[PDB]
């Protein structure tokens, strides 16, 4: 009986919920009530990257934390150097409609994609001296929202077709496919372990998938609207989710519950991007009200505001060494902050 | 200078890259952008042939004016997430099939195809991103309506309708109805044209429309406003 199946699903949902209720005696806020706060924190516009003429949609930091990659609708994927604001590379894209960009950990490759439904893998280091399309990965029936490199051969792509995928670059096929997420997946984040990753979708929920086995282990709810950005705590067992409801939700992987929400009555717009610091104390979220906000992770207090972008902040990143925080907004300027 | 030879040469490479970026930006600015939305089978493919994956891109030049037409019919995703990427287009082409008011949607007979057409139009015309962006709204299947009206009166789709079964009165009714969905009249405009397979001046209508939009945009920029 289909009604019996629905009833069983409801019973399982109740079992999950009361399991969380039993597994949560307390909340985060009371636990960290004695620690000293971060206090006021300010980051200046140390560098301003120019040359983009359309809205910036994505950014990614290189592993070394010197190079960075920026994507915009002008059809240009620009690889820049941070301290010396030079364009080490500028790649004309076939599809100007780009929403995702990725820097390979080895720095040899860079990923791009968008409404084209195709993930383009670009080989930077070649004898010819020109960046070329190393591979064109196809198969998602919707736009590619985000994509991160597992390594130089394996890449994860989340799409608006309600699916994530794990592709082998050299063969050009998708080895694994993560399905079961009702909405359009808008962001994914690999763990430092690089085998488990959390992906949030438009159905107001996130799922933690495993790369090897290929099945979701923990499904997290709590948001009132779409999820636009997701990121992992530097350790690995916690993850933060930026949503369209002006709240950033931090969860633990082991507890399977919502550890905290971040909101203040002033902010009403959605959260375009989310990020973390090196120690995990600071959570940086870019909003549509044109200013990045820095929250304290252990105390839901907002640590500060990075203002200076005249339009919607569309992407955030933190250098691997943790020294710099890069914000790329729709105003066609990326700013580095310290 | 306090910069090495290689540092200076890298700066020179960056200068070349900025020069090329400015050139490409000028080339893009010379170009006129159209976003084409067809509510189901609304003559999108036919008109696309006449003027000549997720997105289908076309480029054509008419009398020294360049046009990039973007079709998103195959996206089949939440439009709220990718409709803002087209903010800044010169115009939105919107295809509505007049023959569809007798026909019904594939998802049961509960909704008329015209009904879905007007909800989609009310969504896109009044969208926050397309606040000041003009719409060239093409009424397609004019011959099919002309041959087919006498069979089924328009009152079935519009119960408030009370008029003759001739083409002109019905077409005027629909055009007025669609122009009535415009919540905000002052900022934007709606250009209506009826097209068939035989006509060859539909793209001319597109050109006059975008010429009006270009003149309006510069009037805003040049100070005349």
């Amino acid at each position, epitope marked *: 009986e289909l009604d019996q199946l629905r009833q069983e699903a409801e019973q399982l949902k109740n079992q999950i919920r009361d399991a969380r209720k039993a597994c949560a005696d307390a909340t985060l806020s009371q636990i960290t009530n004695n620690i000293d706060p971060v206090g006021r924190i300010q980051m200046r516009t140390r560098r301003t990257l120019r040359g983009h003429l359309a809205k910036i949609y994505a950014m990614h930091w290189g592993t070394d934390s010197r190079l960075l990659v920026s994507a915009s609708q002008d059809g240009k994927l620009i690889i820049w150097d941070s301290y*010396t604001t*030079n364009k*080490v590379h500028a790649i004309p894209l076939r599809s100007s409609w780009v929403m995702t960009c990725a820097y390979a950990p080895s720095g040899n490759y860079v990923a791009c994609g968008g409404l084209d439904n195709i993930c383009s893998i670009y080989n930077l280091k070649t*004898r010819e*001296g*020109n960046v070329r399309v190393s591979r064109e990965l196809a198969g998602h029936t919707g736009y590619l929202s985000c994509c991160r490199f597992l390594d130089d051969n394996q890449i994860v792509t989340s799409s608006g077709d309600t699916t994530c995928a794990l592709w082998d670059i050299e063969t050009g096929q998708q080895t694994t496919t993560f399905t079961g997420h009702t909405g359009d997946v808008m962001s994914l984040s690999l763990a430092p372990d690089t085998r488990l990753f959390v992906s949030g979708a438009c159905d107001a929920s996130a799922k933690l998938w495993d790369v090897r086995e290929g099945m979701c282990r923990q499904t997290f709810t709590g948001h009132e609207s779409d999820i636009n950005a997701i990121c992992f705590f530097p350790n690995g067992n916690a993850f933060a989710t930026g949503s369209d409801d002006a709240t950033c939700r931090l969860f633990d992987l082991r507890a399977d519950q919502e550890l905290m929400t971040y909101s203040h009555d002033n902010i009403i717009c959605g959260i375009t991007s989310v990020s973390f610091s090196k120690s995990g104390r600071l959570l940086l979220a870019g909003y549509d009200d044109f200013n990045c906000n820095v929250w304290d992770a252990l105390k839901a207090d907002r640590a500060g505001v990075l203002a200076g972008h005249d339009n919607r902040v569309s992407c955030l990143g933190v250098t691997d060494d943790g020294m710099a925080v890069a914000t790329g907004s729709w105003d066609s300027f990326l700013k580095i902050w310290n | 200078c*306090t910069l*090495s*030879a*290689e540092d200076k040469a890298a700066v020179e490479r960056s200068k070349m890259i900025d020069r090329n970026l400015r050139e490409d930006g000028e080339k893009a600015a010379r170009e006129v952008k159209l976003l084409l939305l067809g509510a189901g089978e609304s003559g999108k493919n036919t008109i696309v042939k006449q003027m000549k994956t997720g997105i289908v891109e076309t480029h054509f030049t008419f009398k020294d004016l360049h046009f990039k037409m973007f079709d998103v019919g195959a996206q089949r995703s939440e439009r709220k997430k990718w409709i803002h990427c087209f903010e800044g287009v010169t115009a939105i082409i919107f295809c509505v099939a007049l023959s569809d008011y007798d026909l019904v949607l594939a998802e049961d007979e509960e909704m008329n195809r015209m009904h879905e057409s007007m909800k989609l139009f009310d969504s896109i015309c009044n969208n926050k991103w397309f606040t000041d962006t003009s719409i060239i709204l093409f009424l397609n299947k004019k011959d099919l309506f002309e041959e087919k009206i006498k069979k089924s009166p328009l009152t079935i789709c519009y119960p408030e309708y009370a008029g003759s079964n001739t083409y002109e009165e019905a077409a005027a009714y629909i055009q007025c109805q669609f122009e009535d969905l415009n919540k905000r009249k002052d900022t934007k405009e709606i250009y209506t044209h009826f097209t068939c397979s035989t006509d060859t001046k539909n793209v001319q209508f597109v050109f006059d429309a975008v010429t009006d939009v270009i003149i309006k945009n510069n009037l805003k920029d040049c100070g005349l406003f």
Partner: single-chain antibody, 232 residues
Framework: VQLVESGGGLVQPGGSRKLSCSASGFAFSSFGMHWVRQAPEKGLEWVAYISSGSGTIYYADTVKGRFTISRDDPKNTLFLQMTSLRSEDTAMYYC??????????????WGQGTTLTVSSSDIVMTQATSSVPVTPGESVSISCRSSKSLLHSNGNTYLYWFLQRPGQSPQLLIYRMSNLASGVPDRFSGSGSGTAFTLTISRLEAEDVGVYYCMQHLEYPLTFGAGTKLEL
């Protein structure tokens, strides 16, 4: 990737002539170019350099004004115009390519070579050894000493190591004292302290037999090492 350079031959003294260098297999527009000549019995010496887009056209001090160099980007060619040759100009001219950005490998590819015969405050480079016996499979350290500190405040020291097999073009080994050239075995490594820099060969092979040269890339007039030759 090829660098074919044509011309050469015997020229009467005081003559004027154009050396040619035709490039293929890479974006000639994006790569700056160099002409670097070698005397019949002496080491390499820099001659000319032209940047991408012809922004800079530099020549060595001893040869300024007399020499010119231009590029044809549509046809992917490099030309070196030559005036009033002397006996000092009898040499083997090599066509070299370079590119300049963070992480790039300048002087990575070298040309085959052209022969030219003529009838009758710069940084000092010292390769004090100039002759070392080598036994295959044993680590050799070849040290090149510069006059002034090759370190720069940016965090880079600019030394380049080149290997020349006999009857063959020079090949890049190490750039910036510590970055291994792509396509070169790991047996070679580099290490330096800002005034003297050593190339270390772990296990010698037949391919390792040749002459080694050290370049500095701080001041624009490029200076070359005398050449440490390997004798087995």
């Amino acid at each position: 990737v090829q660098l074919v350079e044509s011309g050469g031959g015997l020229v009467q003294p005081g003559g004027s002539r154009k050396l040619s260098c035709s490039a293929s297999g890479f974006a000639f527009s994006s790569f700056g170019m160099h002409w670097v000549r070698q005397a019949p019995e002496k080491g390499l010496e820099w001659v000319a350099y032209i940047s991408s887009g012809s922004g800079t056209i530099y020549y060595a001090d001893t040869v300024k004004g007399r020499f010119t160099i231009s590029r044809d980007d549509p046809k992917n060619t490099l030309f070196l115009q030559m005036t009033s040759l002397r006996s000092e100009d009898t040499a083997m001219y090599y066509c070299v390519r370079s590119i300049y950005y963070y992480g790039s490998s300048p002087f990575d590819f070298w040309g085959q070579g052209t022969t030219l015969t003529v009838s009758s405050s710069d940084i000092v480079m010292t390769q004090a050894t100039s002759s070392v016996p080598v036994t295959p499979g044993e680590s050799v350290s070849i040290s090149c000493r510069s006059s002034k500190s090759l370190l720069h405040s940016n965090g880079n020291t600019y030394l380049y190591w080149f290997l020349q097999r006999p009857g063959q073009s020079p090949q890049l080994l190490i750039y910036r004292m510590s970055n291994l050239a792509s396509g070169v075995p790991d047996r070679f490594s580099g290490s330096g302290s800002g005034t003297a820099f050593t190339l270390t060969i772990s296990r010698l092979e037949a391919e390792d037999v040749g002459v080694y040269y050290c370049m500095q890339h701080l001041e624009y007039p490029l200076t070359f090492g005398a050449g440490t030759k390997l004798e087995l």
